[PDB]
Amino acid sequence: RLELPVIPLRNTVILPHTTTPVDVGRAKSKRAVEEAMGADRLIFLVAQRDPEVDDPAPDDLYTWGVQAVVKQ
Amino acid sequence: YQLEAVKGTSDPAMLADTIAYHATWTVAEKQEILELTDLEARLKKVLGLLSRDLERFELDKRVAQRVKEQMDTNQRESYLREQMKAIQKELGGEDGLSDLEALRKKIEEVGMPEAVKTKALKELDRLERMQQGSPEATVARTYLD
Amino acid sequence: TNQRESYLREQMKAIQKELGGEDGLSDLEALRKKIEEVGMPEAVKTKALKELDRLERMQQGSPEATVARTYLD
Amino acid sequence: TNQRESYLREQMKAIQKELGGEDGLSDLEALRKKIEEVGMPEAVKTKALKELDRLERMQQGSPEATVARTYLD
Amino acid sequence: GRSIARSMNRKFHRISLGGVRDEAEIRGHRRTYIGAMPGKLIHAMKQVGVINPVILLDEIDKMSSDWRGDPA
Amino acid sequence: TNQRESYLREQMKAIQKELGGEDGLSDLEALRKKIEEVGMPEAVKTKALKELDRLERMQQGSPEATVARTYLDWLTEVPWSKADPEVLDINHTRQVLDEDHYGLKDVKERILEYLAVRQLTQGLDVRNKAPILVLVGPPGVGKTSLGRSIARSMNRKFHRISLGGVRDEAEIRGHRRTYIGAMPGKLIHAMKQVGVINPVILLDEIDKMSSDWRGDPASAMLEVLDPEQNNTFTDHYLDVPYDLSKVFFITTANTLQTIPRPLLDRMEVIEIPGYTNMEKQAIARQYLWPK
Amino acid sequence: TNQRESYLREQMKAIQKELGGEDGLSDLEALRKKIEEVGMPEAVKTKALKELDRLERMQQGSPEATVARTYLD
Amino acid sequence: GRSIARSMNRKFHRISLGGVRDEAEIRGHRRTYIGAMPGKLIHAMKQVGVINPVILLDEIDKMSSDWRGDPA
Amino acid sequence: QVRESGMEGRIEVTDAAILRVISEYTREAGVRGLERELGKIARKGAKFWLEGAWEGLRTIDASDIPTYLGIPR
Ligand SMILES: Nc1ncnc2c1ncn2[C@@H]1O[C@H](COP(=O)(O)OP(=O)(O)O)[C@@H](O)[C@H]1O
Numbered sequence: 001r002l003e004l005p006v007i008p009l010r011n012t013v014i015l016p017h018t019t020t021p022v023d024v025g026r027a028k029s030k031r032a033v034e035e036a037m038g039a040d041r042l043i044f045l046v047a048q049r050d051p052e053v054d055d056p057a058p059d060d061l062y063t064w065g066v067q068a069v070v071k072q
Numbered sequence: 073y074q075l076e077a078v079k080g081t082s083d084p085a086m087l088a089d090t091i092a093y094h095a096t097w098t099v100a101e102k103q104e105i106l107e108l109t110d111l112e113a114r115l116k117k118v119l120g121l122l123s124r125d126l127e128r129f130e131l132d133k134r135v136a137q138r139v140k141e142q143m144d145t146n147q148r149e150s151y152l153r154e155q156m157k158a159i160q161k162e163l164g165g166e167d168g169l170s171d172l173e174a175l176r177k178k179i180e181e182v183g184m185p186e187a188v189k190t191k192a193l194k195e196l197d198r199l200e201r202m203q204q205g206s207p208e209a210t211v212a213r214t215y216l217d
Numbered sequence: 218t219n220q221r222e223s224y225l226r227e228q229m230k231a232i233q234k235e236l237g238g239e240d241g242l243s244d245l246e247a248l249r250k251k252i253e254e255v256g257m258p259e260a261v262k263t264k265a266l267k268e269l270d271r272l273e274r275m276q277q278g279s280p281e282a283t284v285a286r287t288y289l290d
Numbered sequence: 291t292n293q294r295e296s297y298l299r300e301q302m303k304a305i306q307k308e309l310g311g312e313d314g315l316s317d318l319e320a321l322r323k324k325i326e327e328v329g330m331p332e333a334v335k336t337k338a339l340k341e342l343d344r345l346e347r348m349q350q351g352s353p354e355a356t357v358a359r360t361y362l363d
Numbered sequence: 364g365r366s367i368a369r370s371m372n373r374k375f376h377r378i379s380l381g382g383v384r385d386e387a388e389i390r391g392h393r394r395t396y397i398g399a400m401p402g403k404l405i406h407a408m409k410q411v412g413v414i415n416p417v418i419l420l421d422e423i424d425k426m427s428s429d430w431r432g433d434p435a
Numbered sequence: 436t437n438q439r440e441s442y443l444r445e446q447m448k449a450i451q452k453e454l455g456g457e458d459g460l461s462d463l464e465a466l467r468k469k470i471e472e473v474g475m476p477e478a479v480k481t482k483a484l485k486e487l488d489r490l491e492r493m494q495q496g497s498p499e500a501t502v503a504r505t506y507l508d509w510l511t512e513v514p515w516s517k518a519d520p521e522v523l524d525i526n527h528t529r530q531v532l533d534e535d536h537y538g539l540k541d542v543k544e545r546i547l548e549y550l551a552v553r554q555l556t557q558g559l560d561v562r563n564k565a566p567i568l569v570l571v572g573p574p575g576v577g578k579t580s581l582g583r584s585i586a587r588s589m590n591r592k593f594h595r596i597s598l599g600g601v602r603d604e605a606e607i608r609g610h611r612r613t614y615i616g617a618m619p620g621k622l623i624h625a626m627k628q629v630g631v632i633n634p635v636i637l638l639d640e641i642d643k644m645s646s647d648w649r650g651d652p653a654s655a656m657l658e659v660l661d662p663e664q665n666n667t668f669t670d671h672y673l674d675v676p677y678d679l680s681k682v683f684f685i686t687t688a689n690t691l692q693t694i695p696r697p698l699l700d701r702m703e704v705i706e707i708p709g710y711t712n713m714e715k716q717a718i719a720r721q722y723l724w725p726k
Numbered sequence: 727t728n729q730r731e732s733y734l735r736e737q738m739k740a741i742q743k744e745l746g747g748e749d750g751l752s753d754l755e756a757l758r759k760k761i762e763e764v765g766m767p768e769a770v771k772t773k774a775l776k777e778l779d780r781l782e783r784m785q786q787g788s789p790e791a792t793v794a795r796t797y798l799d
Numbered sequence: 800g801r802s803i804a805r806s807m808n809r810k811f812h813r814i815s816l817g818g819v820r821d822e823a824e825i826r827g828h829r830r831t832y833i834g835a836m837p838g839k840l841i842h843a844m845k846q847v848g849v850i851n852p853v854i855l856l857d858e859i860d861k862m863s864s865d866w867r868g869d870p871a
Numbered sequence: 872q873v874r875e876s877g878m879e880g881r882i883e884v885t886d887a888a889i890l891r892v893i894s895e896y897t898r899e900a901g902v903r904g905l906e907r908e909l910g911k912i913a914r915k916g917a918k919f920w921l922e923g924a925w926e927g928l929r930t931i932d933a934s935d936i937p938t939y940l941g942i943p944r
Pocket of ligand 1: 535536537538539574575576577578579580581718722
């Protein structure tokens with residue numbers, strides 16, 4: 001929802017109620033990963049577009065963002 | 073595991089979203105799926121894309137079997153045809169070279185210049201084609217006529 | 218390489234001649250679909266194919282050969 | 291019909307990739323690109339698919355491939 | 364005409380259509396050799412590259428018209 | 436037997452590709468090398484990338500690789516970022532036209548005015564948006580040796596390209612590098628003849644170009660005459676323009692009238708007569724008889 | 727290195743035996759020895775060497791070599 | 800020219816240049832495949848066996864100058 | 872013609888000189904001949920400044936007209 005970090009999903013949105021892996025290699029989204037443990041394991045997983053830069057701009061994000069309770 | 077991951081579903085969103093993620097189509101079509109905020113509209117759209125990709129599968133599958141059946145019929149047609157070209161390796165090519173032998177005997181009874189004998193041998197390299205009774209071999213048999 | 222080349226040469230037979238994509242090499246198909254479309258009397262068809270034979274015994278390099286092309290059209 | 295014709299386009303590019311093995315994408319596939327995404331009516335579009343199919347014969351020893359290329363231009 | 368173009372803020376063009384005698388170079392010439400070419404109208408149309416340009420045509424009073432089609 | 440003969444045949448055609456086909460790939464690799472040594476601009480590097488996708492041919496008869504590498508030969512051979520340190524002295528030209536020709540002292544000063552506005556350009560780049568020179572006279576006048584005079588007078592290089600016999604625009608706008616015979620007009624052949632990017636290039640007998648061909652090579656000249664478009668000039672064979680603002684073109688004719696209308700623009704007229712019999716003696720005794 | 731180029735040449739020639747026509751192709755090898763032994767200038771010789779190794783094509787099936795005979799002779 | 804060949808002690812090979820139209824034969828023809836024939840000149844200076852023959856260029860006023868390349 | 876001349880700020884033709892250039896050189900109802908007049912003025916003045924200014928403001932009055940151009944036509 002609000003004040004939750006955003007992980008740009010790599011070229012594929014995470015459809016709900018699905019056991020999916022979310023991989024973060026860039027340090028700029030690793031900052032949102034480290035903030036995500038401060039968000040009670042509830043990440044506002046807003047996916048970016050098909051092209052994604054190393055420093056992910058929020059303008060490249062989609063208008064639909066999924067929220068996931070982190071299993072591990 | 074995509075098939076057993078979508079079995080045992082209570083919620084409609086437990087089924088349809090899991091299936092549409094585990095299915096195989098484009099990522100820009102995800103936006104029209106979610107922008108259709110009614111779950112009936114999402115379910116009908118995902119069903120339509122599933123049917124579209126399934127029909128593409130039957131299309132590619134029937135042309136793959138068309139490729140393998142034309143492979144089979146060209147293989148066996150060529151197999152009977154190489155029984156024919158094996159007789160032409162054995163009996164028919166000997167008869168063509170017997171025509172060339174008769175005209176080469178006429179070469180040694182009138183007497184070519186040896187460069188013309190060499191050219192008879194050269195288009196006999198264009199001839200002496202045991203692999204197939206080529207139209208080039210027919211026209212070089214006319215040449216040696 | 219030759220195995221996959223044979224597979225794609227079989228696939229192009231399988232997918233375009235069967236379905237309604239294209240009629241193969243459409244330079245000759247254009248050169249004959251310009252004949253088929255019009256419905257002239259067949260004497261003019263024989264004249265068109267005569268000019269076609271004239272433009273097939275040469276590779277369209279004469280100055281009159283392009284006049285023959287555009288006149289065939 | 292559209293999901294058939296998409297696959298028909300996918301295999302329609304396959305003959306020009308065989309041409310692009312020797313005579314590469316440099317200008318020829320660029321003309322294939324100017325066939326579609328440059329906006330034209332469907333009569334032009336079908337004529338341009340026909341005109342790609344007028345090509346892909348052979349290019350070493352013919353300006354007829356070049357003249358099909360330039361009318362395709 | 365250039366002033367009219369920039370007043371209209373659509374692109375100026377000019378082609379010396381003076382002395383042009385040939386519809387086989389204005390409606391062009393159907394080709395089997397390297398070198399037949401479409402109209403200077405067609406060429407100017409490319410040179411603006413826009414369906415609504417401001418194209419001056421030059422000196423049409425002296426329109427020679429003998430052979431290769433009348434472009435009139 | 437078929438298995439054995441196919442197995443051996445493929446190996447011997449493979450070695451034939453090592454023998455006949457591989458030399459073509461190696462020579463085209465060497466032409467890629469001369470791209471990397473010649474110092475192309477990055478747009479001309481993009482044309483060299485088009486070359487990299489064009490050098491993949493067994494060349495026999497109208498071959499794409501041979502006329503493509505011919506375009507590469509032209510493009511490397513039209514020079515790149517050479518300086519030609521042109522002496523910015525009108526007086527140097529003033530002494531050159533005297534030392535190499537007698538002259539009427541009635542036509543040299545128009546050349547000097549032209550080179551003056553070359554020396555007083557609004558751009559720091561030397562520009563030619565003013566009308567360009569045209570010479571009209573007898574053929575026997577030393578127009579080409581005046582080209583040599585303005586070569587050495589401006590430290591440039593003069594290259595005898597007699598354009599006056601050239602007729603077809605297919606010669607001028609050389610066509611695509613898909614067929615051998617896509618050969619440019621004599622400007623790229625003289626720009627071959629220079630290894631500095633700003634030479635003396637002469638344009639010859641535009642009255643004597645009568646349009647005996649489809650297409651207008653006078654229009655192609657107007658594409659290289661207007662300095663707002665010689666720098667954007669391509670033919671078919673060029674795709675990134677060789678900029679010809681540096682590549683100065685002097686036009687020169689003999690008859691006043693049969694120059695085409697699309698080339699009467701941007702002209703400044705210079706009319707030279709013959710020589711008086713005393714001046715004929717002078718040119719003979721100090722030049723022609725010593726020659 | 728030179729004896730390696732030689733041995734690959736008589737395996738090239740050894741496979742010219744048993745294949746195609748040794749008559750004609752041995753004419754091409756003696757021909758190309760005549761081609762080498764007339765005294766070429768070095769640019770002439772080097773740009774003849776590619777044409778020489780292209781004349782190594784078998785004359786009938788690769789008829790480029792056939793006109794290469796009438797070129798390098 | 801035969802007397803010149805006696806005098807200069809050189810070989811010659813005369814050749815005929817009347818009514819010849821194509822640089823398939825005026826110049827060599829492009830070797831597209833088998834049977835590309837380059838014409839009279841290369842055979843003519845193939846018949847000589849020296850790099851210094853005298854070459855008899857004959858009836859040159861009888862040209863027919865046209866396409867497939869030019870005699871001049 | 873002065874921006875085209877590239878000797879700006881230094882050439883200053885008086886208007887009476889301009890009227891005299893109209894009155895002496897060119898008789899066209901167009902203007903391009905007068906532009907060529909002023910171009911010749913600019914060319915000869917560029918030659919004159921090229922060795923140095925006698926004035927940093929070339930007052931081109933009715934006097935110096937055949938000094939930057941040919942005698943009144
Ligand atoms: N004042 C002069 N006018 C013309 N030519 C001169 C003069 N002084 C010397 N010459 C020499 O006379 C020759 C003229 O003959 P030519 O070279 O045929 O002229 P072009 O080839 O330039 O038409 C020139 O090469 C030039 O070097």
